[PDB]
Design a protein around this nucleic acid. Structure first.
Lengths: 197, 156, 126, 36, 106
RNA sequence: GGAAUACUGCCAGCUGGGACUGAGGACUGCGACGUAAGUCAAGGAUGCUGGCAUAAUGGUUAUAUGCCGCCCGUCUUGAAA
RNA sequence: AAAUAUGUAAAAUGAAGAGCUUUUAGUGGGCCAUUUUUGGUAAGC
RNA sequence: GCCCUGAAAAUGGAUGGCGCUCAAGCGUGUUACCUAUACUCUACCGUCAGGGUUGGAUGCCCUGACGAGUAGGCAGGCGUGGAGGUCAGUGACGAAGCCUAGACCGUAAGGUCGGGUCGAACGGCCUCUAGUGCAGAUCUUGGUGGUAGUAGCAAAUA
RNA sequence: UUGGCGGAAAGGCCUUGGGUGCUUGCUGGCGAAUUGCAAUGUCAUUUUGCGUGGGGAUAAAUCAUUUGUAUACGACUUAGA
């Protein structure tokens, strides 16, 4: 219902998230996916790496600059999975893809917005315990992505700042909770509680 | 001749219609529409206003009033399908609305008969309204849907 | 003011144009049926042009009627016009293309006197 | 890490219909040899 | 107040269709807050408007309206079928529509 | 020992919401309700109300968008190429 | 002795067209599969 | 029973793709839902059929059922040159023809009207008659494109 | 206006002080009608111009000429008040 929906991609299964995002974009919702380096794929790391290497060997023989472009970054791997689920060669598909942004980490301005999750795509809710799974950052770094460390350092800095913000918010929440607990005995409090509030 | 005349012509005798078996029986309103109920206008220049339902007219319209002094909605008629009937009611025992009808609202400045009738009806409506708390403020306020409001589940 | 009629419904307002008349200038749009044994248009494959057929025929009550509800009768002079003297609710007069302006004014005056609708009273008007 | 070619699971119409004919012939010969 | 809305928001999803043929005479509409056909039953017969803007002013407005109604429910998830006086343009797949509370049975 | 409920079926039981359609054109028929007069949902839509009266509806045309649509004819063979 | 699978002759179900005599046109290849059957191959057949 | 092995080459590629792992795989059960020119109901067109019609009968009224199609068969229509009759038909106050982002009728062959251009003839109806309707024939004659301002005008000393 | 903080795409967050409004925390008093029983019934934000009054700043590139670290033509690279 929001004008823009920001999905924290951490702990999501790539294909189920891609299916959800594709339907939302086609239905007209603006979506920003952050932390694409923390997406999961079910199956062993060696298996998913083998699948990527098969993708890598696919190329146009007489001119490689024409063949499939193998993007290494996690955001681009997710974008590929999504474009496969959109009819991207039509004007409607292009307009749908114009409604999507995908990022590694959480850069500005989304680092101060609310992030949501997609429960039907969450690894902890979908995969059975004991099943091996792959992380997109490791897969990307093994296939040639070169910014894993930079993103990790930036995310550590963001987490430090976010922890400070949350400490201040926790203090203010405690103060407001006390101010409301001192008002639980009033006539307005009794009337509101009778009405359910 | 540019065109040869037809040897046969359709008749110009305008035949009458057959006798129609379609009687006009009185409209049956839904149960929630009883006089005195507060109803929310859904369209018109007064959309979102909360008014009081007085009586059911012969052209199947509903006679409503704000009352005019509470929210600025005069004595009017409205269509029943363009309102929501809420559960709040006010007594209309002391209100005399037997002089209002289609000929009263015939259109064919603002008439003094309508002004004075509005004052007279507003007097008794105000007297009855001042019994339950916050009802005058409720009638002054306008209605709208909020974020997350689901009309199929809202109780009106 | 014609005789009352049902609302006129046209089943197919679009013109039936010949196959590949758009593609070739030498192929005119006048309808022709394709007669090749392998014609996909003849065999009625999906996504091709529609072809004329009797099912498209219009209701017999509102056939030949103008929107005003009259059938068109071409008149060349006042004697032709006066044939419609009694059938003014069923027939409207259309002046023939080759009538001169000075005869058109006479025909229009006579039609107005007789209460006959004229489909083209603006032809050759000064 | 030279990943080799993978066999296609996309079945061709020619192979599918040939297999159908092979199965029919197999059943007919099964009946005849059961008779014999 | 800051809200004056007397309608429910909806999205124009697509035409009624099979896999390979569409019917532009029926539009599928996703109404906000409606997740089952049983709840979708509330909105049957309600008026629906597509409100758009045009550069050229026409009879004292630059705002144009396509009117229609909700006809029946569609599927298992609360999507409805709607019919408009003129069929909705196809570029409006994913655009917003207004479902009004009238004609009202409450 | 006494019930209830489920399930399956029946009602010439009652009642609410939605959609598409309104063909026909004096009367004639079969019925229903009434002591009668007559009335009726009974051989197919009527009643009340509003705005506009023109590009507003609509037509035509150019484009855009969604889905669909292989280049015609001949000639061969079941058939296709 | 239930009937897998054909004939003759007389109850079921359906049917508004039937019989005869003169006449006229086009046609005169096959491919694929099921079933039964006879003969075969390493296997197809 | 499911899983691995149970051999397979050579441009890069395919359960249709994406992707999917308490599946979006496999076996099975119960429901809901989606949509064909199919089924039901209605309107309309045509064909056929069955009833009625002494007061445009080649018609008119009522009712029912049907509608794929090559060769071929049968029927009803549309258009063209010329001929007999007729409309005491159209016309220099503008015939014919041509152009038209305009209008109307017909399922269609086609027909009609407005506007422009133009300058001398031409139509409706009932009949007669034929050198009577074109996308093709490596068709005939004439006209005209792309290719393209491209190939080329570099022998003969200057 | 004070004082900070944020470089991942910071372009935003927080705070200081005074001024200026509103306040539905509570009680009152006037107005609304006629848009005629509905008609988005017009309230958002992109850009481009024209007019006013408040300020600000006073260039280059290309051809032509020229070089050969370049060169089929373009292009490239030098120089010239």
């Amino acid at each position: 219902v929001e004008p823009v929906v920001v999905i924290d991609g951490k702990g999501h299964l790539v294909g189920r998230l891609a299916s959800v995002v594709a339907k939302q974009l086609l239905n007209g919702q603006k979506i920003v996916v952050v932390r694409a380096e923390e997406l999961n794929i079910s199956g062993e790391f060696f298996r998913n790496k083998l699948k990527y290497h098969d993708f890598l060997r696919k190329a146009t023989a007489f001119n490689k600059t024409r063949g499939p472009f193998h993007f290494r970054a996690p955001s681009r791997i997710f974008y590929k999975a999504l474009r496969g689920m959109v009819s991207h060669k039509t004007a409607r598909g292009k307009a749908a893809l114009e409604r999507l942004k995908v990022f590694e980490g959480i850069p500005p301005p989304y680092d101060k917005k609310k992030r949501v999750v997609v429960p039907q795509a969450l690894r902890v809710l979908r995969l059975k315990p004991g099943r091996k799974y792959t992380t997109l950052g490791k897969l990307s770094t093994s296939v040639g992505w070169k910014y894993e460390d930079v993103v990790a350092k930036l995310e550590a800095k963001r987490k430090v700042s976010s922890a400070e913000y949350y400490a201040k918010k926790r203090a203010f929440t405690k103060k407001v909770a006390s101010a409301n607990a001192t008002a639980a005995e009033s006539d307005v409090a009794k009337q509101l509680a009778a009405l359910g509030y | 001749s540019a065109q040869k005349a037809p040897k046969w012509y359709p008749s110009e005798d305008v035949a009458a219609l057959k006798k129609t078996r379609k009687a006009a029986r009185p409209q049956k309103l839904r149960a929630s529409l009883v006089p005195g109920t507060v109803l929310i206008l859904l369209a018109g220049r007064f959309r979102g206003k909360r008014v009081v339902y007085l009586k059911h007219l012969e052209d199947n319209t509903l006679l409503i009033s704000g009352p005019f002094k509470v929210n600025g909605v005069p004595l009017r008629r409205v269509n029943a399908r363009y309102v929501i009937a809420t559960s709040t009611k006010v007594s209309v025992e002391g209100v005399n609305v037997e002089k209002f009808n289609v000929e009263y609202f015939a259109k064919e400045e603002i008439k003094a008969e309508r002004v004075e009738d509005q004052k007279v009806v507003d007097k008794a409506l105000i007297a009855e309204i001042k019994k339950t708390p916050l009802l005058k403020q409720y009638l002054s306020a306008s209605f709208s849907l909020k974020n997350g409001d689901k009309p199929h589940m809202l109780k009106f | 003011a014609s005789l009352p009629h049902p609302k006129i419904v046209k089943k197919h307002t679009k013109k039936f144009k010949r196959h590949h008349s758009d593609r070739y200038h030498r192929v005119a749009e006048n309808w022709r049926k394709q007669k090749g044994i392998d014609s996909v248009v003849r065999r009625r494959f999906r996504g091709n042009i529609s072809q004329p057929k009797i099912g498209y025929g219009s209701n017999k009550k509102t056939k030949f009627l103008s929107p005003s509800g009259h059938k068109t009768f071409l008149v060349a002079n006042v004697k032709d016009l006066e044939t419609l003297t009694m059938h003014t609710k069923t027939y409207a007069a259309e002046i023939a293309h080759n009538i001169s302006a000075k005869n058109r004014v006479v025909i229009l005056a006579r039609a107005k006197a007789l209460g006959i609708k004229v489909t083209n009273p603006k032809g050759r008007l000064a | 890490m030279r990943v080799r070619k993978r066999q296609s699971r996309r079945t061709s119409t020619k192979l599918k219909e040939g297999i159908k004919k092979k199965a029919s012939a197999h059943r007919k010969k099964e009946k005849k040899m059961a008779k014999k | 107040a800051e809200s004056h809305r007397l309608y429910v928001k909806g999205k124009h999803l697509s035409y009624q269709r099979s896999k390979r043929v569409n019917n532009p005479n029926v539009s599928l509409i996703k109404i906000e807050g409606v997740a089952t056909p049983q709840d979708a039953q509330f909105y049957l017969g309600k008026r629906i408007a597509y409100v758009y803007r045009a550069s050229k002013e026409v009879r004292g407005s630059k705002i144009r309206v396509m009117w229609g109604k909700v006809t029946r429910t569609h599927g298992n998830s609360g999507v409805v079928r709607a019919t408009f006086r003129n069929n909705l343009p196809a570029k409006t797949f994913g655009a917003s529509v207004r479902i009004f509370l009238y004609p009202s049975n409450i």
